[PDB]
Amino acid sequence: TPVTLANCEDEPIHVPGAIQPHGALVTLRADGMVLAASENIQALLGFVASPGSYLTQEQVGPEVLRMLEEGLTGNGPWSNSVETRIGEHLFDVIGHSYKEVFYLEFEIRTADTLSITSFTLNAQRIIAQVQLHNDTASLLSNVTDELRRMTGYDRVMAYRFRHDDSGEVVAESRREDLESYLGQRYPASDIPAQARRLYIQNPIRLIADVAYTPMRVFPALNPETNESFDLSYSVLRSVSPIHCEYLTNMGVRASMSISIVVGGKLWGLFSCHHMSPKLIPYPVRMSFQIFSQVCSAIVERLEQGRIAELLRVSTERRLALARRARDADDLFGALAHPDDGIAALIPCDGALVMLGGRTLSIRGDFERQAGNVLQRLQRDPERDIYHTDNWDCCGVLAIRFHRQESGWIFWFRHEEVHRIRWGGKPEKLLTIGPSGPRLTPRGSFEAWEEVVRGHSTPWSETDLAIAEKLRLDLMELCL
Amino acid sequence: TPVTLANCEDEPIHVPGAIQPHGALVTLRADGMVLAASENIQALLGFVASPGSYLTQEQVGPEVLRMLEEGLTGNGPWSNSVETRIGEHLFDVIGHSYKEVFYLEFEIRTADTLSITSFTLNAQRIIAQVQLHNDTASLLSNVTDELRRMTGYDRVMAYRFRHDDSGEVVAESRREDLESYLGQRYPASDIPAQARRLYIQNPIRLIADVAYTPMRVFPALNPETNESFDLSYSVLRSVSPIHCEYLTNMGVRASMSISIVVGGKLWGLFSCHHMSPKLIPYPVRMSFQIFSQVCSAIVERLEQGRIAELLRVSTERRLALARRARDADDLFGALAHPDDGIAALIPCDGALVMLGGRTLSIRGDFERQAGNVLQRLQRDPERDIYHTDNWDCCGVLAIRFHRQESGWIFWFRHEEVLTIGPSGPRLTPRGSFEAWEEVVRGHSTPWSETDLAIAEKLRLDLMELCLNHA
Ligand SMILES: */C=C/C1=C(C)C(=O)N/C1=C\C1=NC(=C\c2[nH]c(/C=C3/NC(=O)C(C=C)=C3C)c(C)c2CCC(=O)O)/C(CCC(=O)O)=C1C
Numbered sequence: 001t002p003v004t005l006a007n008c009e010d011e012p013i014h015v016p017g018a019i020q021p022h023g024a025l026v027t028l029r030a031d032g033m034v035l036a037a038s039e040n041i042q043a044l045l046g047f048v049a050s051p052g053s054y055l056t057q058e059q060v061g062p063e064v065l066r067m068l069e070e071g072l073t074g075n076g077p078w079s080n081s082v083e084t085r086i087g088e089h090l091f092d093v094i095g096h097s098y099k100e101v102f103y104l105e106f107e108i109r110t111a112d113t114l115s116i117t118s119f120t121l122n123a124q125r126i127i128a129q130v131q132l133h134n135d136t137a138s139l140l141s142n143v144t145d146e147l148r149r150m151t152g153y154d155r156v157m158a159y160r161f162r163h164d165d166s167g168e169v170v171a172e173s174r175r176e177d178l179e180s181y182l183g184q185r186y187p188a189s190d191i192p193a194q195a196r197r198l199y200i201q202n203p204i205r206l207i208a209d210v211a212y213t214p215m216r217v218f219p220a221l222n223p224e225t226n227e228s229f230d231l232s233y234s235v236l237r238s239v240s241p242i243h244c245e246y247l248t249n250m251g252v253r254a255s256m257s258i259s260i261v262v263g264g265k266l267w268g269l270f271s272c273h274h275m276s277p278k279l280i281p282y283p284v285r286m287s288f289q290i291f292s293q294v295c296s297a298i299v300e301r302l303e304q305g306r307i308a309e310l311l312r313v314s315t316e317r318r319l320a321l322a323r324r325a326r327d328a329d330d331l332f333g334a335l336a337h338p339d340d341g342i343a344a345l346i347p348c349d350g351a352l353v354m355l356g357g358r359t360l361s362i363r364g365d366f367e368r369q370a371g372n373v374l375q376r377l378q379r380d381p382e383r384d385i386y387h388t389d390n391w392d393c394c395g396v397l398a399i400r401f402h403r404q405e406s407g408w409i410f411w412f413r414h415e416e417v418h419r420i421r422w423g424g425k426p427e428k429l430l431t432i433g434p435s436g437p438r439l440t441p442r443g444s445f446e447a448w449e450e451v452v453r454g455h456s457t458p459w460s461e462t463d464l465a466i467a468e469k470l471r472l473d474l475m476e477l478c479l
Numbered sequence: 480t481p482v483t484l485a486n487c488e489d490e491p492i493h494v495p496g497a498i499q500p501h502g503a504l505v506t507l508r509a510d511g512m513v514l515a516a517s518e519n520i521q522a523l524l525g526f527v528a529s530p531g532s533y534l535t536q537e538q539v540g541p542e543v544l545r546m547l548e549e550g551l552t553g554n555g556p557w558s559n560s561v562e563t564r565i566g567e568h569l570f571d572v573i574g575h576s577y578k579e580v581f582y583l584e585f586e587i588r589t590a591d592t593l594s595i596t597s598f599t600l601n602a603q604r605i606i607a608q609v610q611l612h613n614d615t616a617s618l619l620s621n622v623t624d625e626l627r628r629m630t631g632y633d634r635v636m637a638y639r640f641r642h643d644d645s646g647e648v649v650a651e652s653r654r655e656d657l658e659s660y661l662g663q664r665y666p667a668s669d670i671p672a673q674a675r676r677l678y679i680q681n682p683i684r685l686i687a688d689v690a691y692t693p694m695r696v697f698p699a700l701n702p703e704t705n706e707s708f709d710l711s712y713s714v715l716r717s718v719s720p721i722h723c724e725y726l727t728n729m730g731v732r733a734s735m736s737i738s739i740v741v742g743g744k745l746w747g748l749f750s751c752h753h754m755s756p757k758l759i760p761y762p763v764r765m766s767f768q769i770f771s772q773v774c775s776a777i778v779e780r781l782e783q784g785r786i787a788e789l790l791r792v793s794t795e796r797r798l799a800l801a802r803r804a805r806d807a808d809d810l811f812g813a814l815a816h817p818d819d820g821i822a823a824l825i826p827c828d829g830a831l832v833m834l835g836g837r838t839l840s841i842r843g844d845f846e847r848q849a850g851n852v853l854q855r856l857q858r859d860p861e862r863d864i865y866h867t868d869n870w871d872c873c874g875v876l877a878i879r880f881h882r883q884e885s886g887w888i889f890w891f892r893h894e895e896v897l898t899i900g901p902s903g904p905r906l907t908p909r910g911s912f913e914a915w916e917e918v919v920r921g922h923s924t925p926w927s928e929t930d931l932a933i934a935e936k937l938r939l940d941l942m943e944l945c946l947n948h949a
């Protein structure tokens with residue numbers, strides 16, 4: 001059924017019946033028999049791959065056939081890209097085997113191929129820069145700027161995805177002309193499950209011309225299975241109408257994205273946008289897929305090194321709490337210490353200490369809410385750690401360290417705030433599509449707002465780790 | 480100037496006019512004027528080089544000269560390459576630029592391949608190994624295996640260079656007919672200073688054939704400076720006769736290495752040895768060059784991640800020490816404690832604690848020695864911190880934490896512990912190990928700056944406690 005805003009969350013974009021027109025596609029079954037092909041084989045390649053047929057050396061050349069032959073029956077690895085000029089143009093021919101189907105893709109090459117030396121040199125510079133700077137925010141920033149020098153794209157941004165899958169533009173190099181989307185936030189809904197899986201499975205993804213018209217592949221179904229063809233790993237797999245509308249609203253008509261994958265999760269991706277159709281040669285894209293690997297590798301460690309630091313200041317800051325509580329025998333004093341205090345342990349907008357009936361509220365008037373939270377927990381006598389990002393103050397983390405005299409510690413966070421807003425000279429809409437204003441950056445951001453309304457920043461894994469240890473410390477102190 | 484074992488430490492391996500015969504070299508000055516070339520240029524290539532000669536289009540083709548042209552007009556260290564025709568035993572023309580000399584190196588592109596020569600394909604495969612592992616040891620162990628699978632070398636090893644630059648075989652996958660070299664410690668003098676400057680500035684080295692026949696370049700002197708050509712960044716640079724003699728004693732005749740550089744140190748390298756002559760294509764070597772950098776990067780933050788962990792357990796067990804010491808007023812109880820004690824604070828074979836006339840030693844008898852040390856610390860009575868590796872036992876790290884009652888804490892470490900050529904057994908693994916034994920005799924594994932940082936921190940902790948006792 002036709003994709004609407006109402007059902008786009010479930011659009012199966014891995015089994016579209018089409019490909020992008022700047023290439024051709026022939027899908028083969030495990031024994032070499034053609035199962036399907038795209039409308040334009042004869043026009044682009046000058047021959048008709050008929051279902052039931054087997055390709056000949058005559059049709060598609062020795063280079064392609066030899067790859068096709070070692071590629072089909074595929075124990076062990078094999079070169080899966082080949083050059084050949086079947087016609088008058090130049091074709092990179094790319095083959096891969098997913099499920100049990102073999103996809104043979106013909107993509108026209110335009111620009112000079114990858115200069116492997118001048119790519120190695122560029123790889124040095126980037127690794128050398130992040131050698132100096134162990135900010136993962138600096139890596140993103142540098143590689144972003146660098147991607148634009150290399151590719152020549154009009155804009156390249158770096159997205160970081162939070163735990164709730166929402167996105168944030170944490171870097172950007174555009175040409176002076178264009179408006180900046182720096183600091184943009186967008187909801188999980190802007191990158192649906194299927195699209196997200198595809199960003200994890202595929203490092204690089206390219207959209208040559210957004211204002212194109214899809215070239216269908218027939219037959220639509222796989223006669224061997226009576227189900228659609230899975231084009232997850234296809235270089236030419238067509239784009240969604242929804243997205244294409246979104247992109248044209250922005251005035252963008254060529255996209256090129258490099259994934260950053262850590263764990264199973266998609267940690268973020270570099271998005272390259274062009275204002276006119278743009279095509280990047282397969283082997284070049286393959287060099288960028290290397291960046292995808294390197295960044296993912298580096299970013300992973302930079303991140304685990306950061307939580308490592310958080311954990312170090314935590315323990316050191318707990319050590320001070322012991323150096324301090326055991327001397328004068330007053331928790332409150334130690335806990336309320338400005339720099340090393342609990343309000344500084346876990347990032348928050350305020351804290352509250354309870355022991356006996358004594359209440360020390362730090363950075364605001366938190367007794368009332370701490371009182372109300374406690375009344376709730378009264379109906380839940382066995383809970384020792386409470387935390388919610390719903391509820392003055394909607395984020396709450398409570399740990400009980402002494403039950404008899406009801407000793408608790410509370411951290412509070414206010415609603416989540418958009419870090420950086422742009423203002424002044426406002427809003428050149430460019431055309432709006434039929435689907436509505438939802439498919440514009442402003443529409444997306446407003447969609448994010450509605451999502452986070454009433455929610456604080458989520459209690460990190462580490463924030464919870466530190467609090468659980470702090471609770472253990474407080475328990476033994478009271479003993 | 481013959482290479483003798485005694486002289487070889489100064490051997491200038493970076494200048495010798497010889498190259499390896501599997502390729503051809505042509506050296507030009509800034510303006511494209513030929514200054515020198517190997518005596519096999521016309522053997523492999525169409526024509527003959529000659530000083531004063533500005534490169535002939537007819538012999539080198541359009542791409543190459545056209546490449547050199549854009550290179551010439553660039554004032555930075557030029558590095559580029561193209562694959563092109565020359566009589567149709569076609570080549571990879573790979574050029575660089577050191578000083579103001581332009582070098583063109585010619586490698587034969589071999590049609591018959593049973594493996595994948597795609598630069599992007601190979602690069603993606605090894606680099607994938609980096610993303611997988613957390614151990615810096617696991618990584619080395621696994622990339623070692625993957626390298627042997629990818630290249631098919633008879634043996635591939637991974638070295639780690641300690642503080643004294645003595646290396647250690649930490650990982651190894653071999654053909655099961657070959658003896659194991661795992662653990663082998665060899666002296667720093669098996670890799671001279673010059674060899675190291677090169678391994679550091681060059682991610683990849685390739686010796687195609689060990690019993691090679693040095694293909695001389697003429698002229699030998701650089702006409703302009705009248706001083707030797709520096710082939711530091713050359714691929715086809717000839718190989719030291721001493722090293723070659725070393726490899727032949729081992730029955731090795733083909734060799735490739737991947738450097739690992741963190742900071743400016745040859746942290747370690749992957750060495751591939753083959754028992755028969757072997758050759759890797761240029762683009763595949765570039766596959767390993769970019770891996771060298773990526774691996775270096777990841778290894779660095781894997782290491783600094785490791786010390787960060789060390790420091791966390793330090794602050795952690797240091798915290799427990801403080802708790803234990805404040806709970807019951809007596810220090811010794813927490814210092815002597817098994818897992819959270821000082822003996823487990825810093826890698827050591829033993830520990831000792833002095834406070835007043837009361838001395839407590841952990842895991843050994845260090846009282847006699849603690850005394851001697853303490854006695855040398857009579858001089859410089861202001862010395863709060865001390866450490867060394869020479870001296871009974873040789874690893875001594877001492878900190879003072881209480882002046883009035885001579886409160887000291889010590890950590891102690893023990894000492895670390897048939898077809899040969901004309902130079903003798905010195906150039907065999909057996910010789911190397913022995914040589915290393917000589918070097919390490921009176922030295923214990925050095926105290927890392929992390930060990931010292933921990934001791935230094937501990938010391939501060941203790942003083943604070945003693946002041947608080949009052
Ligand atoms: C009904 C589902 C979708 C809605 C709603 C929507 O807006 N897009 C939907 C589907 C897809 N989005 C895909 C990629 C994609 N979309 C965005 C969204 C943005 N939100 C913003 O605020 C901004 C810019 C300010 C953007 C661009 C992004 C960031 C991406 C990733 C690629 C890119 O950055 O261009 C997508 C995949 C298409 C494909 O196959 O490439 C689908 C489907």
Ligand SMILES: */C=C/C1=C(C)C(=O)N/C1=C\C1=NC(=C\c2[nH]c(/C=C3/NC(=O)C(C=C)=C3C)c(C)c2CCC(=O)O)/C(CCC(=O)O)=C1C
Nearest residue numbers: 487488492660663665668669670674719722725750908911
């Ligand atoms: C007189 C100086 C040298 C001595 C002594 C020596 O053994 N080699 C000397 C000069 C050079 N060594 C070079 C490289 C090199 N040598 C070793 C030595 C080993 N010691 C061992 O115990 C084992 C094995 C158990 C070995 C292999 C190594 C490891 C290396 C690095 C390269 C490799 O691993 O093969 C060297 C550089 C030669 C070049 O140009 O590649 C010089 C010069």
